[PDB]
Amino acid sequence: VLLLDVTPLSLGIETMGGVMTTLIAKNTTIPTKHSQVFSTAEDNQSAVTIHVLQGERKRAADNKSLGQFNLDGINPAPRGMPQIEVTFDIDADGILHVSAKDKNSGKEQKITIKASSGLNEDEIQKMVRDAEANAEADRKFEELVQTRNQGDHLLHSTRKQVEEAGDKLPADDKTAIESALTALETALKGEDKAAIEAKMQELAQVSQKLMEIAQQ
Template sequence: ITRAKLEALVSDLLEKLEGPCEVALKDAGLSPDKVKEVILVGGMTRMPAVQERVKKIFGKEPDKGVNPDEVVALGAAIQGGVLKGDVNDVLLLDVTPLSLGIETLGGVMTKLIEKNTTIPTNKSQVFSTAEDNQPAVTVHVLQGEREIASGNKTLGRFELVGIPSAPRGMPQIEVTFDIDANGIVNVSAKDLATGKEQSIRITASSGLSQGEIDRLVKEAEVHAEEDRNKKELVDARNAADALIYTTEKSMNELGDKVESSTRAEVEDAVNSLKGAMENEDTAEIRRLTEGLSQASHKLAASMYEQASQAGAQQGGGGPEGAWQHQQGSSGSDEDVVDADYREVG
């Protein structure tokens, strides 16, 4: 067989060399000209076509000063020695090949552990319910780089039940990802109010092959703009839904205390925003959300004005005293994220 024939037979494999190199450069935050030296490792790097492709990618001649077969065997021997405990002066670090997270409101993936995080590692984040009186949540564990949950690989699902009845956004569900040195992933969800907890264990065999990892990374790059637009739409809808919920709740609580003109203005803004949410115009949803926000400010102004008048009639301290009381009794909810969980039962 001639060299030309061989190179023609493996041309598709040669094309695949560029992808992993480009990903490595991107993850490292480097451009090819910032790489000082490229070392060829593995028997197939003896092939001139491979060496030429590496030169094309990095813009420099690769280093051929090591035996490409021996270094692979040597690396395996060192790893074996480290795992057995015979080698103590070498630190080998492993990383997560893809990001890990869960599906949240609107079908998006919320990442808890980013790609290339050194393991072992542990990360927790607090989420909440998406509906009033939601009794249970389903935790959908994902692996991948897509913004949209459906574009990633499902690693597992589990349910946390027995959540006490409460308004949406009030329950606090702490989700924890724990990856040990062997790459085994433990995911748990704990209701911070009741202490109830459920978890799932994902072994290394549940992961992906290198080919599947490369495919998912490439798909994330190809669909990056599409996913970004979808996520922006989901975020806009979530923000609008949250504002509608709090506004309608405030109007119901205030009842007849709201002037009819103010109520009509707010109701019109709510209805317009609800209509926009059924479409996919992100800019229009954001515009109407801002409009409802401005209209809802009148509700707050009306509420505080009435509270101030009532305080003055009773000889009370007025708004400053009320603010101090609220300030002292309020809790922080900066880490709470609305999550789209499926109800059970």
């Protein structure tokens, strides 16, 4: 063939922390189909917003918004237990269907995106350019969001373990841990990666008996 139809930019969805997670990489021959499983961030969450993005930047806000839709009717569950499978499907005509399917409940919602959506040739180029001009800030951004999500995980996990421990936990351990979890929660409200890791480590430093209880 003398030609190939390819995606000029990456396609994906916004995930927790405001980061674009890629489902179809830049430069993919179409027709193409890819799927990944995502989940909930909060206990008892009833819905997820799927926000479809085109572009090469790490910040979702820095990419082109192709549309969003909600999947609701997610049944009560602990965070991270629902299996929300997201599929990007680009048919032979260049049309993108994104769907989100709850593997438990069976619910499905889609958005269809025409082949002529997104950035034009000019902007595809200004976009590829910046992904490079800013490769650094993006990396610092992405690792901040990862730290933040790791801190939020440990925040939630440790609180749950404290409950499940209840009386097994000495009051001197419980006072230290709950003070660390307050400072953690205060830090996660910030954009300071080192300060988030300091409170994470503080918590790991005081939680050792908790961990030994939780393991038994």
